[PDB]
Amino acid sequence: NSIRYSELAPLFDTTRVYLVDNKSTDVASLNYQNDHSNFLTTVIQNNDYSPGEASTQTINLDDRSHWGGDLKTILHTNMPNVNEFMFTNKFKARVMVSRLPTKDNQVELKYEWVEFTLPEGNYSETMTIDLMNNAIVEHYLKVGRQNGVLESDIGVKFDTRNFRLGFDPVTGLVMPGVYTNEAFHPDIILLPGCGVDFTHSRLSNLLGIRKRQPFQEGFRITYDDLEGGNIPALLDVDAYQASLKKPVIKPLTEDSKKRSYNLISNDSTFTQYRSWYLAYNYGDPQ
Amino acid sequence: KFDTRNFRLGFDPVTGLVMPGVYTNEAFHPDIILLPGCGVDFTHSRLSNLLGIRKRQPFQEGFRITYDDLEGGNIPALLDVDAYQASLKKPVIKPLTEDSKKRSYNLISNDSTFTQYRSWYLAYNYGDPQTGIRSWTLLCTPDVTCGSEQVYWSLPDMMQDPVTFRSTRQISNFPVVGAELL
Amino acid sequence: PVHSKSFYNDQAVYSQLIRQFTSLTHVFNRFPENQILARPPAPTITTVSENVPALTDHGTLPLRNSIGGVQRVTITDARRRTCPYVYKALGIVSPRVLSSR
Amino acid sequence: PVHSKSFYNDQAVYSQLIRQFTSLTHVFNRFPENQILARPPAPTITTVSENV
Amino acid sequence: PALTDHGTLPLRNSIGGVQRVTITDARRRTCPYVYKALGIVSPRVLSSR
Amino acid sequence: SEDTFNPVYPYDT
Incomplete structure (x- = not known):
């Protein structure tokens, strides 16, 4: 029971890894072609290492036991009533x-x-x-x-x-x-x-x-x-x-x-x- | 206009x-x-x-x-x-x-x-x-709110540091415990 | 996240006779004489789409042996492709132990 | 998944006196003279189904 | 006025007397338009050492 | 005039 953050100090059970859409601008170098549908994000969030970083660093999880948490997302679209996409x-x-x-x-x-x-x-x-x-x-x-x-x-x-x-x-x-x-x-x-x-x-x-x-x-x-x-x-x-x-x-x-x-x-x-x-x-x- | x-x-x-x-x-x-x-x-x-x-x-x-x-x-x-x-x-x-x-x-x-x-x-x-404007723009729904920007919550002196977050004292980098939509 | 907003316009039929004056040109009603090629009578209770930011509840999902630094959030459609109409798309994950090996 | 959508039409009764003009033929109100065989007064708050 | 459902979150070894409730925004800053902001926490045992 | 056939629909006026 320990989720490693590579640095700082590992935390025990019941942790939270956020995946926001407000991080795409900062990753300037990955989403420079895709618009909010299939963008890449940094689930690090340290707060002092500037916008994009920790691309090599991985959020470890133990080898002895497998995890598996929830996924409460927050979607919000703005698709018109008629458009070329939906074939209407x-x-x-x-x-x-x-x-x-x-x-x-x-x-x-x-x-x-x-x-x-x-x-x-x-x-x-x-x-x-x-x-x-x-x-x-x-x-x-x-x-x-x-x-x-x-x-x-x-x-x-x-x-x-x-x-x-x-x-x-x-x-x-x-x-x-x-x-x-x-x-x-x-x-x-x-x-x-x-x-x-x-x-x-x-x-x-x-x-x-x-x-x-x-x-x-x-x-x-x-x-x-x-x-x-x-x-x-x-x-x-x-x-x-x-x-x-x-x-x-x-x-x-x-x-x-x-x-x-x-x-x-x-x-x-x-x-x-x-x-x-x-x-x-x-x-x-x- | x-x-x-x-x-x-x-x-x-x-x-x-x-x-x-x-x-x-x-x-x-x-x-x-x-x-x-x-x-x-x-x-x-x-x-x-x-x-x-x-x-x-x-x-x-x-x-x-x-x-x-x-x-x-x-x-x-x-x-x-x-x-x-x-x-x-x-x-x-x-x-x-x-x-x-x-x-x-x-x-x-x-x-x-x-x-x-x-x-x-x-x-x-x-x-x-x-090669027109339909190449880089998109006809979306108006939406008055401007967007669905989500706020962040935190409780430094009580909740443990969430995975990669670190301890500090500034209102611009507090350890987020859970995000909600405005 | 697309819904149906039930309304109620008792003005219908009576607003049709007035909309021909609000607008400066009868575009739709080009044949106000013919009883078949005229303008379709405005039906009662108009339904209009309204993009409502949802808040679903997804079930438990297993994780990898080593979470990456730069994740890839994708939102596929029915025909398996990108949906260029996504304004907001964030997710919260709360991992927990299931069973040992 | 069928619901009830509560509305509010204060135009009722008064819209009845106007709908006879919006439409070109008094189909429902064929007897605008008789006080029993006339058109039923439009009640307030119209409920309409909405597939949610 | 929303009523969200936040998931389980670990606590410290000694909760302070005077807490600090913060509500950050997207650009990391104060939102001078908060009228009501309260929270209920129901702690429970997870696992021993 | 014919004599027996009321459309039963105030067509007038």
Whole structure:
């Protein structure tokens, strides 16, 4: 029972060897490249031999018995909500590239996966969602509007509200004429032939969308997989009360500035906007 | 001039000017805007961590960050809004020089779109990640406390000398018995 | 040491209609007309990260036959690599006898 | 690891009279006339789960 | 106001009457912002000679 | 007017 300090005088059982981070500056010659993650420190602490010293001297422990004490550390980080390190800044998502007229009467539609990038800093779950969509817009303002695709058929859009609370089982349209303004839970709205990649993104968990079997690599979720979750179109309100036969059946096609909701046909009530929240507890659970 | 907002959210990759005509009013993360030939020293200041700007190698003394080091982060000038809608060729290309009370934004020239205002936030994830500022800095969480510096405790006339510590009488080298976080 | 701080903003939805005025440019809400391409309704109870300096309790760990002068404090991550976001990282060790040979 | 986070919304009852305007459609409050089939008055101190 | 848990620490052969409670900082100096600083010690036998 | 069908949702005014 004696811990040798080489000099001074050995102390008996129950001793303390501190390993602080305030000693890195003094060791100027070892941590001259690494920042607080894998730095070297002097667990000597004599108090008169200047900053760094006693590199050759070792804190002895007897050969007859082995020691083994506690380790009550004190960690403290400052890692942002989004950064290149944790892989939360980038997230892929196949969006429309162009859409012109070629072949005479044909209409070719091209789609290509594009890796997006978010800025370092901004926190809060709502603010991150708005930024994920802000990246979808900046992509359109550099490739989209210059080639062909309109502001209407913009693929990929993250939301939070339930697009089926005002839906009536008879008419088939959202009677309020406006989707209920009240968020419930984040998801991923998609248009024909477009999805979102999350194999190299932890932003999937943030939205609250995990796989029942996370051990399988590949979090691909295209539009073809969201069968049975069509967003019910709105009801023509300015026509329903005006006429008062009744309009009812007639859904809202255009609006202010004129932007078509992309209806599947002239007869049906649903649109080409597949929702994730609606495909969960509203579709077929089998 | 210390700021907090992103001066590139309304920026269009075609015209090269902030289309909204006004920088987006929504803070993201604190930084340090600088003009030609001027910087900020932080060798003897803990206010650097507060802004959320740490060096990847904090063991090297000297947190100098001049204007010459912020290459590739020019703040995109605003768009002349009162001229764009009024004319409606289109103005577009013409950036906003003056404003109310008349104060020039300090444009580098009469042809280009960028100004002489180098931004730190724009030099991080928007510049070149191989030779820019993102090489020696880091976008960390603000943290108001400045840091988690741990104090030391001691009781010389009672507790034995902890392993390598030695006996003396000065308030700058007392035998530490146990360290705690402030 | 990253936590979740539960808040409560009853201003939600009602602050959205006001934030479009606090800010000078509708960046996020570029399509205030379309009922699908609009701005996502601000959900109630906003969660934001908060770096809280932890104070764990690690169990007993055997020591070497001769402790070095210059130790090496490392803090590995999940993918086995450096975490450039460590502000403070110190440790206290109180060795004791376990068993003879 | 599921907890209860005690809050405090003095805006209650008064935010109800405003939320009908923040949202575009009175879904919950479909009967703002009837004094029984109306929308339940928002109670003070809202408790919300927090995974700690 | 914290409430830490410091580990076991050896004592002298004869405790003094007037102790000296010090609270050093990182740069090794006084911290003129201490409002409360007390300590409880519960000594016990470790090993014989 | 039809006669029997109240959306049951104060759409007005």
